[PDB]
PDB file of C-alpha atoms in Angstrom:
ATOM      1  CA  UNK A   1      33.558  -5.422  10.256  1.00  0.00           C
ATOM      2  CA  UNK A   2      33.215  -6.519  14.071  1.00  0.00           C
ATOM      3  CA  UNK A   3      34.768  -2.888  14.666  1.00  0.00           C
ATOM      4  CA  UNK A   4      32.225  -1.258  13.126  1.00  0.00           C
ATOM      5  CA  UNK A   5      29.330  -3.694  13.257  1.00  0.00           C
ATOM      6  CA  UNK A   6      28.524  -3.107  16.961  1.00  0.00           C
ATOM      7  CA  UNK A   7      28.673   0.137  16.222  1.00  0.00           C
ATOM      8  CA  UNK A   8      25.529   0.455  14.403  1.00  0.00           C
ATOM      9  CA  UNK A   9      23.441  -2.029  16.728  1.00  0.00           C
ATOM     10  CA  UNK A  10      24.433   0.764  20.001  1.00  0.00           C
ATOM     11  CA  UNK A  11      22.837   3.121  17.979  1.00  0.00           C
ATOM     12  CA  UNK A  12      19.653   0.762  16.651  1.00  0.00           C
ATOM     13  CA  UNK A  13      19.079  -0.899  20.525  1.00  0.00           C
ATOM     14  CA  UNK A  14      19.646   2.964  21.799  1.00  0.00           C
ATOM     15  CA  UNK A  15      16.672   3.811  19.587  1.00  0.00           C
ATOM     16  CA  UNK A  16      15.406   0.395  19.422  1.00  0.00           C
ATOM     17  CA  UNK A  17      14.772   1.982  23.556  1.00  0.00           C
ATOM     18  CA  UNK A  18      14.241   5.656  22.435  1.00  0.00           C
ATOM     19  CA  UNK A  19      10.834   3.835  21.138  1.00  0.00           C
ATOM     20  CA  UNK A  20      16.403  10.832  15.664  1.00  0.00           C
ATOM     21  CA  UNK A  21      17.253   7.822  13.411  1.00  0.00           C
ATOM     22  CA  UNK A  22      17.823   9.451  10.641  1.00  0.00           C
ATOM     23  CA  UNK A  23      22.307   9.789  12.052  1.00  0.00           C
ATOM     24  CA  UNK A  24      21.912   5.977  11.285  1.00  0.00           C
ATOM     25  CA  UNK A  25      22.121   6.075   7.897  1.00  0.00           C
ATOM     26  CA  UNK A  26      25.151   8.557   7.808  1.00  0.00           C
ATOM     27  CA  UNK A  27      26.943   6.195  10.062  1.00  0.00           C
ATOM     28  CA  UNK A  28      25.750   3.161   8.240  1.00  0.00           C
ATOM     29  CA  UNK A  29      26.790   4.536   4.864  1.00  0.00           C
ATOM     30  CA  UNK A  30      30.320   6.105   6.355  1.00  0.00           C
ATOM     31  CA  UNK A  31      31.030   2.179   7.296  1.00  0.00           C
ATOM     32  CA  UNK A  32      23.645  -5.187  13.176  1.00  0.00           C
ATOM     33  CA  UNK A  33      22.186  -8.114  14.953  1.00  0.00           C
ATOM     34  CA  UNK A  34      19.627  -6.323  16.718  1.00  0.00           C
ATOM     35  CA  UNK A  35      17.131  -7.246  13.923  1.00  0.00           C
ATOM     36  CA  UNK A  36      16.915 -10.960  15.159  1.00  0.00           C
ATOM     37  CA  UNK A  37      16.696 -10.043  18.857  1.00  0.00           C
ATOM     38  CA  UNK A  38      14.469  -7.130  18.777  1.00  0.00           C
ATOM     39  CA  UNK A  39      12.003  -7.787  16.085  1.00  0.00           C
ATOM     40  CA  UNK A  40      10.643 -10.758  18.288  1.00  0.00           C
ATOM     41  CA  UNK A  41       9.342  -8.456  20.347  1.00  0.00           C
ATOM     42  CA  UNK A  42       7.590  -6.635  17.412  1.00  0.00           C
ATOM     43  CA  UNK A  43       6.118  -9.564  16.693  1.00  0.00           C
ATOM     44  CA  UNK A  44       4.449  -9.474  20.091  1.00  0.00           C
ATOM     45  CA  UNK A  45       3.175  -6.145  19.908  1.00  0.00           C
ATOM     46  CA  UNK A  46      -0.471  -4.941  23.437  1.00  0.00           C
ATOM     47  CA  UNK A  47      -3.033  -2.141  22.984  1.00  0.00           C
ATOM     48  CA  UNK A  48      -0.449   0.914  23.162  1.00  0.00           C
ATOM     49  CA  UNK A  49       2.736  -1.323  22.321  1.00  0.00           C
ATOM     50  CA  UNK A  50       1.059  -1.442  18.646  1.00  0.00           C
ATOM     51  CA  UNK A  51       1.233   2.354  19.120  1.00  0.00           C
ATOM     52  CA  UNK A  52       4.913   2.102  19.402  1.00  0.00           C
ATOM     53  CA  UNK A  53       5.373  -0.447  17.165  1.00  0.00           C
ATOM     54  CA  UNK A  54       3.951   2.207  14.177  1.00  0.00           C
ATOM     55  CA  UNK A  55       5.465   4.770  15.079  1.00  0.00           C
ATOM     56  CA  UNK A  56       8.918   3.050  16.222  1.00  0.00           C
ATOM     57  CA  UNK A  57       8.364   0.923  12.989  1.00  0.00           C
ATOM     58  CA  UNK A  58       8.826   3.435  10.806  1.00  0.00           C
ATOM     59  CA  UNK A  59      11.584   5.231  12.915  1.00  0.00           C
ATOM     60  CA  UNK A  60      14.408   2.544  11.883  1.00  0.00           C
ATOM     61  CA  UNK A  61      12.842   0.374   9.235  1.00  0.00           C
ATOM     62  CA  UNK A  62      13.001   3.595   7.158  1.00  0.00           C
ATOM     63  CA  UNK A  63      16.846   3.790   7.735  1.00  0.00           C
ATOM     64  CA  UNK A  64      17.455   0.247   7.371  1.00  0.00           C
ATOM     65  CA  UNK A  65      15.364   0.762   3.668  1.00  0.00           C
ATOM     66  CA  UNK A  66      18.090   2.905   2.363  1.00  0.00           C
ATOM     67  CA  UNK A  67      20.463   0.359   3.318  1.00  0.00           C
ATOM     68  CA  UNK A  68      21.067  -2.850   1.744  1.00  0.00           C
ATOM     69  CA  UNK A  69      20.391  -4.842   4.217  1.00  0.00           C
ATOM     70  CA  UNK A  70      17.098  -6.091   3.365  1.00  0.00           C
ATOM     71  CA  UNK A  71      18.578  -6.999  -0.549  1.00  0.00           C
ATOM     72  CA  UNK A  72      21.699  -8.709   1.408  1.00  0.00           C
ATOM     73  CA  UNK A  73      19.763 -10.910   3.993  1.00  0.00           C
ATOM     74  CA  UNK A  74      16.511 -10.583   2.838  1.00  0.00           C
ATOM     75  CA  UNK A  75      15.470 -13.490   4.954  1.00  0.00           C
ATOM     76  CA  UNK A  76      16.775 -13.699   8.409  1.00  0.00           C
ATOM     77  CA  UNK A  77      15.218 -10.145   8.161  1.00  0.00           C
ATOM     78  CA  UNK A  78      11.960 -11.272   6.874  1.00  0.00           C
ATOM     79  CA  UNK A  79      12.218 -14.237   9.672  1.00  0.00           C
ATOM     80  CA  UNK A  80      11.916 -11.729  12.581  1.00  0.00           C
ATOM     81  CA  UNK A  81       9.839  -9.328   9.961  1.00  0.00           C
ATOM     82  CA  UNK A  82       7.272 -12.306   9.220  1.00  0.00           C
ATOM     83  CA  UNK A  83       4.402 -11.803  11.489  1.00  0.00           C
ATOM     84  CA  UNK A  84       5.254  -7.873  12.307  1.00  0.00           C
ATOM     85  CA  UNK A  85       3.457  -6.563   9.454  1.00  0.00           C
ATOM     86  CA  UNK A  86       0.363  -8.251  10.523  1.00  0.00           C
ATOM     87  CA  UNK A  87       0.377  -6.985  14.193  1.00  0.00           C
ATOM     88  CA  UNK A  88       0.650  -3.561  12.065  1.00  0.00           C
ATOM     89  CA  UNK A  89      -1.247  -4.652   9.112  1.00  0.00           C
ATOM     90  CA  UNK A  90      -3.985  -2.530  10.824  1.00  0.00           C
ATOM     91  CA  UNK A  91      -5.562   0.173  13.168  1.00  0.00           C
ATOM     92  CA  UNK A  92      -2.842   1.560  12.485  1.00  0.00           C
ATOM     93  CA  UNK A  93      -2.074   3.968   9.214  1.00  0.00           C
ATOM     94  CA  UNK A  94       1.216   5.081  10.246  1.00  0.00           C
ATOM     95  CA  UNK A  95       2.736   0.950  10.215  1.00  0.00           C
ATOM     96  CA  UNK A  96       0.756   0.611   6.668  1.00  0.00           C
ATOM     97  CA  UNK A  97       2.499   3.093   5.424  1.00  0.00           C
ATOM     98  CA  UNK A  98       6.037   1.935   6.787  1.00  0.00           C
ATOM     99  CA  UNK A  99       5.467  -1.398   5.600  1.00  0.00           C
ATOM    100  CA  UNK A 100       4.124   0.362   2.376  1.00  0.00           C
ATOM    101  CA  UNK A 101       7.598   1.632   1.743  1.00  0.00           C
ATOM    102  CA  UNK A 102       8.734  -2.082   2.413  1.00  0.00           C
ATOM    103  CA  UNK A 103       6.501  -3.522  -0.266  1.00  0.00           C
ATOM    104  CA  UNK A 104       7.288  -1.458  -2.786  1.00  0.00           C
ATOM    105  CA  UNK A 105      10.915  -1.740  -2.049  1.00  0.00           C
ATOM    106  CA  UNK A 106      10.815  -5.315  -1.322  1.00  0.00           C
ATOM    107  CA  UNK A 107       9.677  -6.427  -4.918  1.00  0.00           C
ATOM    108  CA  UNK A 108      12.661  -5.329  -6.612  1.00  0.00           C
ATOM    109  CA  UNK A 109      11.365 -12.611  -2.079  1.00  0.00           C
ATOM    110  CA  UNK A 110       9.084 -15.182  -3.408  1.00  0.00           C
ATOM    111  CA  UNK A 111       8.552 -16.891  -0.358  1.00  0.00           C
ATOM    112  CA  UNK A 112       7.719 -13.065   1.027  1.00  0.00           C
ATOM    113  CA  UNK A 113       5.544 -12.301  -1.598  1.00  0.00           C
ATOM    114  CA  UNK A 114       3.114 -15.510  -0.879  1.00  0.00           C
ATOM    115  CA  UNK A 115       2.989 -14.000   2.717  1.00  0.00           C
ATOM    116  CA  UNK A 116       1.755 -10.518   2.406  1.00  0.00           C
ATOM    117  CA  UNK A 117      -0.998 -11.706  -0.705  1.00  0.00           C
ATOM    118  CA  UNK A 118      -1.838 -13.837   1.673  1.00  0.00           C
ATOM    119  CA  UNK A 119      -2.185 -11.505   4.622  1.00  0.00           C
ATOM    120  CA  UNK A 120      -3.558  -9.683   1.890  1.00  0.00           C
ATOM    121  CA  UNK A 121      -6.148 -11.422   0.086  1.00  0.00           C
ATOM    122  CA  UNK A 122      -7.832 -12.029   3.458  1.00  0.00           C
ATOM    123  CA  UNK A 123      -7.690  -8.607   4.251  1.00  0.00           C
ATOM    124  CA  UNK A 124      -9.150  -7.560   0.934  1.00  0.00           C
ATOM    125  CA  UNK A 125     -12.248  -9.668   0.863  1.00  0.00           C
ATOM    126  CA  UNK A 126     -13.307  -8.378   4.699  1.00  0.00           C
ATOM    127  CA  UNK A 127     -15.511  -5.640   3.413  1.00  0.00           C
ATOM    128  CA  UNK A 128     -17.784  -8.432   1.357  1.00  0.00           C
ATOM    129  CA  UNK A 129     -14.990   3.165   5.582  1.00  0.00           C
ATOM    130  CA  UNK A 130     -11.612   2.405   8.333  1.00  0.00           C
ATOM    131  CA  UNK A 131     -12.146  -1.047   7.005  1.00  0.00           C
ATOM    132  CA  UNK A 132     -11.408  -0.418   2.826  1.00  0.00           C
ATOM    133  CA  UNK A 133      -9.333   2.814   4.158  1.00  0.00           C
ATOM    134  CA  UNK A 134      -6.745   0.596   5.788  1.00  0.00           C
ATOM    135  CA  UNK A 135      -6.825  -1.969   3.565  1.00  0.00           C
ATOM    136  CA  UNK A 136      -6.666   0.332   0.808  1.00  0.00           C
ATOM    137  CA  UNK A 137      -3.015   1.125   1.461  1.00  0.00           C
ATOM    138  CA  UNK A 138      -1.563  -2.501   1.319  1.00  0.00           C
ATOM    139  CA  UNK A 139      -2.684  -3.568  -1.772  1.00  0.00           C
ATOM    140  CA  UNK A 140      -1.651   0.217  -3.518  1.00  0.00           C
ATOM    141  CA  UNK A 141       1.993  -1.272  -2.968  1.00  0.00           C
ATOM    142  CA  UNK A 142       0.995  -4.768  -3.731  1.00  0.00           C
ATOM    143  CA  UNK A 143      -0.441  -3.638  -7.422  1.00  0.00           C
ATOM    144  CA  UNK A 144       2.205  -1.481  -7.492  1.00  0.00           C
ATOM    145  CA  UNK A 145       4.870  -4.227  -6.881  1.00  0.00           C
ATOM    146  CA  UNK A 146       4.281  -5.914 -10.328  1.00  0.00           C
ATOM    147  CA  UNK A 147       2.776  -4.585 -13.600  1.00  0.00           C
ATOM    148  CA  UNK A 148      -0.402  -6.438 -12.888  1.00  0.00           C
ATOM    149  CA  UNK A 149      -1.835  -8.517 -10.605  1.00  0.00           C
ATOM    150  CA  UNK A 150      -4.300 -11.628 -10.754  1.00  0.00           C
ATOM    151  CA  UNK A 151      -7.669 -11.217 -12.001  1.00  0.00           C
ATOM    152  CA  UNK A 152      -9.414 -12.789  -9.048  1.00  0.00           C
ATOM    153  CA  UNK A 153      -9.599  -9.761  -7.236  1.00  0.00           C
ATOM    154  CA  UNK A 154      -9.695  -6.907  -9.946  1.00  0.00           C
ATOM    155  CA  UNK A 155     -13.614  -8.347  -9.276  1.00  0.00           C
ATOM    156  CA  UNK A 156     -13.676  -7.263  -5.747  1.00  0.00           C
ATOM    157  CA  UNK A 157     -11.899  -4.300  -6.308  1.00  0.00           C
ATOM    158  CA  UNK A 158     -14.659  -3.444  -8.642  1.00  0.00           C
ATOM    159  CA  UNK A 159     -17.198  -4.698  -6.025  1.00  0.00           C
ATOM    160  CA  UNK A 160     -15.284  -1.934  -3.361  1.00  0.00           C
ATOM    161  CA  UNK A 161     -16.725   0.943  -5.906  1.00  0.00           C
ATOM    162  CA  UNK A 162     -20.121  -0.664  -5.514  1.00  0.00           C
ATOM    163  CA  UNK A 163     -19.910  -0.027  -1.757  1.00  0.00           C
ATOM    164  CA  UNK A 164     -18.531   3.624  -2.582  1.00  0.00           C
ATOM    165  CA  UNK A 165     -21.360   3.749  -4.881  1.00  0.00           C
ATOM    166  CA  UNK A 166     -23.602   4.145  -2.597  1.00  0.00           C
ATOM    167  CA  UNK A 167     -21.486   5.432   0.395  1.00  0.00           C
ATOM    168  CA  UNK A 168     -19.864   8.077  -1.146  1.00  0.00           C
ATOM    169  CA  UNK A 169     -23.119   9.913  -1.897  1.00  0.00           C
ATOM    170  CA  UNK A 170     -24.053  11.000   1.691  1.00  0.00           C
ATOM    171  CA  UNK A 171     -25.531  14.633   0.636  1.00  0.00           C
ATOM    172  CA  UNK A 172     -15.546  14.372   7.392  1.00  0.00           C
ATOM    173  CA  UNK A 173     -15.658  10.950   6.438  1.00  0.00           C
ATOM    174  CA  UNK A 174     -17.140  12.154   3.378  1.00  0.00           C
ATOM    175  CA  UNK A 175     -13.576  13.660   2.282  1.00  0.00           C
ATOM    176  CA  UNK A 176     -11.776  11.447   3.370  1.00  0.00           C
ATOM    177  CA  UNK A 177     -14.294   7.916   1.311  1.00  0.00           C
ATOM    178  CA  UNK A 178     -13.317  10.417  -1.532  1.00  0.00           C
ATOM    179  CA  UNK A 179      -9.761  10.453  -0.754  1.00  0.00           C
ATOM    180  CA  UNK A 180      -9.116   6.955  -0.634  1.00  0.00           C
ATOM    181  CA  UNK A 181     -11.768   5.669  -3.687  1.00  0.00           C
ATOM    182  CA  UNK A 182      -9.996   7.573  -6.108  1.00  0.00           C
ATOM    183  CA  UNK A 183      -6.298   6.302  -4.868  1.00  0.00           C
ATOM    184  CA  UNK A 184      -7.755   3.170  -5.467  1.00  0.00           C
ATOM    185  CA  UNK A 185      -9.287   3.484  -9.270  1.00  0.00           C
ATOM    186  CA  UNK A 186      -6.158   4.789 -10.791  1.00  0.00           C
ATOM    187  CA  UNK A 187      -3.917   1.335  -9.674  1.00  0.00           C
ATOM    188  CA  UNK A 188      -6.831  -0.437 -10.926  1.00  0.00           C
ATOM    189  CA  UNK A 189      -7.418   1.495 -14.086  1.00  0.00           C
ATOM    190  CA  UNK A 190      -4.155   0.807 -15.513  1.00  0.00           C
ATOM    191  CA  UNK A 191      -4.906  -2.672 -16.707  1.00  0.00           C
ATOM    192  CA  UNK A 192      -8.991  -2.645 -16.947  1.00  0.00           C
ATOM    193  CA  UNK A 193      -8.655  -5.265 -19.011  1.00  0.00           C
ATOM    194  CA  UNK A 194      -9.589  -8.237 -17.249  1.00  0.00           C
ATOM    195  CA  UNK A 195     -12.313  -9.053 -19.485  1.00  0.00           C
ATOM    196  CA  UNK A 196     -15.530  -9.601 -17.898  1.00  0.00           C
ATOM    197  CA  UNK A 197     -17.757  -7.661 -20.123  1.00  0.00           C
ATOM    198  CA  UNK A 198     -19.011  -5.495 -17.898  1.00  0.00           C
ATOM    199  CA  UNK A 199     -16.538  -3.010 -17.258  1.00  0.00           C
ATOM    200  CA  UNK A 200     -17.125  -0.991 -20.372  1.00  0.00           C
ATOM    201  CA  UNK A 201     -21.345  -0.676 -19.859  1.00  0.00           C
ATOM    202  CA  UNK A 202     -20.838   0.243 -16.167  1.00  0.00           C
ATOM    203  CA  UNK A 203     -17.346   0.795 -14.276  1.00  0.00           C
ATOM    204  CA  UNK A 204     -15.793   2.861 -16.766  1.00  0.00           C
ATOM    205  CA  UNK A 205     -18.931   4.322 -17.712  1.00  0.00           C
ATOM    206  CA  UNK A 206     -21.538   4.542 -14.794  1.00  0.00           C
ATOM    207  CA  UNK A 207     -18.849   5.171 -11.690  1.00  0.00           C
ATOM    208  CA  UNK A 208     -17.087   7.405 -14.239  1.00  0.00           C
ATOM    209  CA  UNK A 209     -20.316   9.768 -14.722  1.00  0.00           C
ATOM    210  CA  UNK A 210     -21.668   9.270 -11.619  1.00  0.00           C
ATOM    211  CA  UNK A 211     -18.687  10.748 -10.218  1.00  0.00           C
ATOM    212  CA  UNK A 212     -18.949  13.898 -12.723  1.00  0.00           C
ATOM    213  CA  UNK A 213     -22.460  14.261 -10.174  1.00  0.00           C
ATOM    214  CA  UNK A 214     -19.696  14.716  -7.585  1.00  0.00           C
ATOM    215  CA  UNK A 215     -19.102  17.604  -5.546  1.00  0.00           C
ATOM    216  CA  UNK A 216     -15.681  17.684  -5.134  1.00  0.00           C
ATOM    217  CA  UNK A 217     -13.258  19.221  -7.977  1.00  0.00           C
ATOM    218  CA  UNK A 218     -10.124  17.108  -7.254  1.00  0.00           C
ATOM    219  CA  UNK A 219     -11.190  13.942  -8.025  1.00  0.00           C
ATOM    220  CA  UNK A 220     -12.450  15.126 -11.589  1.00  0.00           C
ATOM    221  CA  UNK A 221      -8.630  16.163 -12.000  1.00  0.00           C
ATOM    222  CA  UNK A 222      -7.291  12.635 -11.514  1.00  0.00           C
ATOM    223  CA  UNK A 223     -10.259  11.115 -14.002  1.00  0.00           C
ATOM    224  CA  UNK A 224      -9.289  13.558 -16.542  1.00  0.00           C
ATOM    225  CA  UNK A 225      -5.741  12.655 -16.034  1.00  0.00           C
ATOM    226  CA  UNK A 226      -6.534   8.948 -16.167  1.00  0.00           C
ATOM    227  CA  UNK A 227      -8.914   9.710 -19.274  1.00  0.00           C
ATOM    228  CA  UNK A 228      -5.581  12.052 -20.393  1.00  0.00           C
ATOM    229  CA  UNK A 229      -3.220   8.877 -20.491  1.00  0.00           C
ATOM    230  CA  UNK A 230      -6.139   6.388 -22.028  1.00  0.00           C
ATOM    231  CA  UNK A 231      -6.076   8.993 -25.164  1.00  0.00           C
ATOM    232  CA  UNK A 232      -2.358   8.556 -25.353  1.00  0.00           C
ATOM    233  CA  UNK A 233      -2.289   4.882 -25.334  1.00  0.00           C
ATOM    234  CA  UNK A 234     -10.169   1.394 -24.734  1.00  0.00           C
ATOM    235  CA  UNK A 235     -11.047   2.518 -28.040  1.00  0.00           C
ATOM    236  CA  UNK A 236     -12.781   5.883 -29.060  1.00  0.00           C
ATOM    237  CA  UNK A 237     -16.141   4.638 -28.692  1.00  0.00           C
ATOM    238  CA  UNK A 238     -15.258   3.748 -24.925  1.00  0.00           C
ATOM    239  CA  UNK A 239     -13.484   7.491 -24.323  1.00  0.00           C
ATOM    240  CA  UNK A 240     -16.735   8.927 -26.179  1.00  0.00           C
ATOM    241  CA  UNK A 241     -18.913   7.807 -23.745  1.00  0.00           C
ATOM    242  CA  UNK A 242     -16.288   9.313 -21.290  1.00  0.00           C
ATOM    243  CA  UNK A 243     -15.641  12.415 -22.490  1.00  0.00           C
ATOM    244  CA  UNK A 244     -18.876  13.873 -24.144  1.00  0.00           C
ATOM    245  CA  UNK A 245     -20.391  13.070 -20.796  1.00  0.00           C
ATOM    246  CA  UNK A 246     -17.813  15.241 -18.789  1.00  0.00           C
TER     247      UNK A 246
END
């Protein structure tokens, strides 16, 4: 498809420039070596590059989600892709979010997934609220890759509620602690079974009624939702305690 293979790269190094995308995919579909060439660079980028590395990031990485590149090639993709996600792994929500779309997509890459548990792991255990709000958004895909993940950090992620424990209760950063904690619960409440005994007596139970305290009506909605689904298959001595206290 040399006819219609350059085609596509004008359009990717005249936006791979520009920093209107979306044309790419129409033209893609109707049917690319600038991934090898260019993404170097991405690796590289420095203070405002990053800036255009989020934003261009998620310009044509979107387009080239839809198509199958990334399931065709997978690798030479992931070989100028390997280190970009960490140059946008942070202070940046806009490249989280790109990649976010990648990780979910990606799953369904061995080799791949050792790299971003890796890059994740590390980033995960940092906090020991940008910090948990950033780092929230790579392991939502992660978790959301497979059914479940390993138990090793279902711990810290219950140690992350002890910090919002006792940050969320200030009385905007206050909206948006709430924001994120509650995006993070509901990945993590779907197995709660990693058996360590103390999950029922004060996760589930303590963080659960503390948060009926709360001042903020939305994030009842979601427990009450996550309570909703429990119902419809813990046992009902664990969604007593739940829902007599509510």
């Amino acid at each position: 498809d040399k006819q219609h293979t350059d085609t596509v790269v004008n359009f990717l190094i005249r936006v791979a420039c520009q920093v209107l995308s979306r044309r790419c995919v129409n033209l893609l579909k109707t049917a690319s070596e600038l991934k090898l060439q260019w993404f170097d660079k991405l690796l590289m980028t420095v203070n405002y590059g990053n800036i255009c590395t989020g934003l261009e990031v998620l310009s044509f990485l979107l387009t080239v989600l839809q198509s199958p590149a990334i399931l065709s090639s997978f690798k030479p993709l992931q070989r100028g892709i390997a280190a970009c996600m960490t140059c946008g792994n942070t202070k940046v929500l806009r490249a989280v979010h790109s990649l976010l779309s990648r990780l979910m997509s990606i799953f369904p890459y061995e080799e791949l997934e050792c790299l971003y548990a890796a890059v994740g792991k590390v980033i995960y255990e940092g906090l020991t609220p940008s910090q948990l709000f950033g780092t929230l958004m790579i392991l939502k895909s992660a978790c959301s890759n497979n059914p479940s993940y390993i138990d090793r950090l279902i711990s810290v992620f219950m140690r992350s509620l002890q910090k919002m424990v006792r940050e969320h209760l200030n009385p905007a950063t206050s909206g948006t602690s709430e924001l994120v904690m509650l995006s993070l619960e509901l990945v993590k409440t779907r197995l709660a079974v990693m058996s360590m005994e103390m999950r029922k007596n004060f996760i589930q139970a303590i963080l659960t009624s503390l948060i009926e305290k709360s001042p903020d009506a939305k994030i009842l909605r979601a427990v009450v939702k996550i309570v909703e689904e429990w119902v419809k298959n813990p046992t009902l001595r664990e969604k007593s305690i739940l829902l007599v206290k509510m």
